[PDB]
Ligand binder design. Structure first.
Ligand code: FE
Ligand code: FE
Length: 691
């Protein structure tokens, strides 16, 4: 009984009052119901919801962070939309408003008077204090950052600060008696409009608010030109040029709920209806996004125009975005701890074997490389978005997903070039030449042809990888038009698929027989090597891999049991012309050319990453000083851990620094078409964030 009634948590009396009106109008029109829980602060509401005593609460970005921590672990389910109907946006701008007359710039605020929306709020605290840090001369913890702020500004109103401990921080506040410097409407200088009033009254010199506040609060535009903006370029521009004069671009306030049984569906149901019925000018009897005269921003932001549903994959960290998320965390760190983390590279391992190899690397990196890890490649990408990881080597298929998530290629895996040169001295600058995606079959099955491969059993490296999937399936899809990929072959092993599907049938999990179809090295049939073993052991009739995979796994080149006797002659390639050729003629018999695997990272990490990786490969690379004496980066024994084992070196992108430029027009077009049939949650997640 999850759709009984949505319990909305309020943090004040008139909030409870408006909520009660909401409740009657919803019943007043036979809509999805809602009940009103009373608390006295955002924190109490987060707690309430966490322990199943409330369902939903709207929070500022700064309290979205708080709410997502343990033990609470809540998540944004719906985002407030701002702007207009023509140009809606799920973000706003933290700005610094001043009076037109003074002549100080943002970098000249020492000894001045500041008005803040509230402690720990996005526009009122996290952004401005983050921006002003270099000027703060804060020695770091354990001295609380507040103390440095109390010394920087001669006096401010920061609602919710400990006036006893940080009295300067509560000085300008206007609250009366116990309501002085309170985190609520009782304090007239609380929130966006309060902080703007704090400035208007002349109490403060600067107000840290959002871009709209000045337009919501001043009707006549003559008064609006009495105010100015401080730009981070230490210039002053009019209040209409916020797009070119802001301290940060930040994610809209959002409705949070539990991550488990939070009644997300019921919640979104109520919201959509509430919005349609009581949205902007839908009915005068009730206004979802309006507050009574002396009130502002009750339940939701006034002048919001609706909500947008937050895709399921997104948690508090993903929602906040890498910039803002790590900026908040940084506020409790010293400038040396922050600089150390900026200098180190956190790799993301996929599965315990990669982590294992990663740690070995870590121990020998002299503080430059550390390790993170997850069980899928998509979870790792997510970690990179959240900043708890920095980099990894990816197949071209995942470079697409990474690129649509904002990530970028930095270096590429360079493989034994087309018999061009010796162990190349200039490997690092040799442009990549791609590798060959092929279809391998057993020599004995003399009947198997490209034309007759449909309906047979298939072995793939994984879903969404270049050679194992995007290229074969793209070819098959371009014939028929069916998005029913699990109907192309009788059975397959295609890790990353639905375990109950026929695409998982041939998979065999780990030695114990667990982790079947898991898209990581624990699955014995995962990857280049695994998809070939899938064929050698006669599980499928065709393995979609690259040609060197066969070379590397036969003729005693792999002394592992399943392969120790495999001869290159026992296998053949399928040509698209319907012919079949020996593996050695792959250049004249392959499905397509695949772009090299590449290391991807956040834009902020590119330069550091490049320097570290170059250095590290000079030590542990192919001709690394410490390889093979100590450690080799590109070795693992046909297991392709972290990097392909046949990597010659990591090479320069030669200007192809975007996924589109790196993957190529045709390939990107190919995957985009494939993706009409189905996209991942990560992909849905990132499209929401990109908007
Ligand atoms: Fe805000
Ligand atoms: Fe690949």
């Amino acid at each position: 009984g999850r759709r009984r009634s949505v319990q909305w948590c309020t943090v004040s009396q008139p909030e409870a009052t408006k909520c009660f009106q909401w409740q009657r109008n919803m019943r007043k029109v036979r809509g999805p119901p809602v009940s009103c829980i009373k608390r006295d602060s955002p924190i109490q509401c987060i707690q309430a919801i966490a322990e199943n005593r409330a369902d939903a609460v709207t929070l500022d970005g700064g309290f979205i962070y708080e709410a997502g921590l343990a033990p609470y672990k809540l998540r944004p389910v719906a985002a407030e939309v701002y702007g207009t109907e023509r140009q809606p946006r799920t973000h706003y701008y933290a700005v610094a408003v001043v009076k037109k007359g003074g002549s100080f710039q943002l970098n000249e605020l020492q000894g001045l008077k500041s008005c803040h929306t509230g402690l720990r709020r996005t526009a009122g605290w996290n952004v401005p204090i983050g921006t002003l840090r270099p000027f703060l001369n804060w020695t770091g913890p354990p001295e609380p950052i507040e103390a440095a702020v109390a010394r920087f500004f001669s006096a401010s109103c920061v609602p919710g600060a400990d006036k006893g401990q940080f009295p300067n921080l509560c000085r300008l506040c206007a609250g009366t008696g116990e309501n002085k410097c309170a985190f609520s409407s009782q304090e007239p200088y609380f929130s966006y409009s309060g902080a703007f009033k704090c400035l208007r009254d002349g109490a403060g010199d600067v107000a840290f608010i959002r871009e709209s506040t000045v337009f919501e609060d001043l009707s006549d535009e003559a008064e609006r030109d009495e105010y100015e903006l401080l730009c981070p370029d230490n210039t002053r521009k009019p209040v209409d040029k916020f797009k070119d004069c802001h301290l940060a671009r930040v994610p809209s306030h959002a409705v949070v709920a539990r991550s488990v049984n939070g009644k997300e569906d019921a919640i979104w149901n109520l919201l959509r209806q509430a919005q349609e019925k009581f949205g902007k000018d839908k009915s005068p009897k009730f206004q979802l996004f309006g507050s009574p005269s002396g009130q502002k921003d009750l339940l939701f932001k006034d002048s919001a125009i609706g909500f947008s549903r937050v895709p399921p994959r997104i948690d508090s960290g993903l929602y906040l975005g890498s910039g803002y998320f790590t900026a908040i965390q940084n506020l409790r760190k010293s400038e040396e701890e922050v600089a150390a983390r900026r200098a180190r590279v956190v790799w993301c391992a996929v599965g315990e074997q990669e982590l294992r190899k990663c740690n070995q690397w870590s121990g020998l990196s002299e503080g430059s490389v550390t390790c993170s890890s997850a069980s899928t490649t998509e979870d790792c990408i997510a970690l990179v978005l959240k900043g708890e990881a920095d980099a990894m080597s990816l197949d071209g298929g995942y470079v697409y997903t990474a690129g649509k998530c904002g990530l970028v290629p930095v270096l590429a895996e360079n493989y034994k070039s087309q018999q061009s040169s010796d162990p190349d001295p200039n490997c690092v600058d040799r442009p990549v030449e791609g590798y060959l995606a092929v279809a391998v079959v057993r020599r004995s099955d003399t009947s198997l042809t490209w034309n007759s491969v449909k309906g047979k059993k298939s072995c793939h490296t994984a879903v969404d990888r270049t050679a194992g999937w995007n290229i074969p399936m793209g070819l098959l899809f371009n014939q028929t038009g069916s998005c029913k990929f699990d109907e192309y072959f009788s059975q397959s092993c295609a890790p990353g698929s639905d375990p109950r599907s026929n695409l998982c049938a041939l998979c065999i999990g780990d030695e114990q027989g667990e982790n079947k179809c898991v898209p990581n090295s624990n699955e014995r049939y995962y990857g280049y090597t695994g998809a070939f073993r899938c064929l050698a052991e006669n599980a499928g009739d065709v393995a979609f891999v690259k040609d060197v995979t066969v070379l590397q796994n036969t003729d005693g080149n792999n002394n592992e049991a399943w392969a120790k006797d495999l001869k290159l002659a026992d296998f053949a390639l399928l040509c698209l012309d319907g012919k079949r050729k020996p593996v050695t003629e792959a250049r004249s018999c392959h499905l397509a050319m695949a772009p090299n695997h590449a290391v991807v990272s956040r834009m902020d990490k590119v330069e550091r990453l490049k320097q570290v990786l170059l250095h590290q490969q000079a030590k542990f690379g192919r001709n690394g000083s410490d390889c093979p004496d100590k450690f080799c980066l590109f070795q693992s024994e046909t297991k392709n851990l972290l990097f392909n084992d046949n990597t010659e070196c990591l090479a320069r992108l030669h200007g192809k620094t975007t996924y589109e430029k790196y993957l190529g027009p045709q390939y990107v077009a190919g995957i985009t078409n494939l993706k009409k049939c189905s996209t991942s949650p990560l992909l849905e997640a990132c499209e929401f964030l990109r908007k």
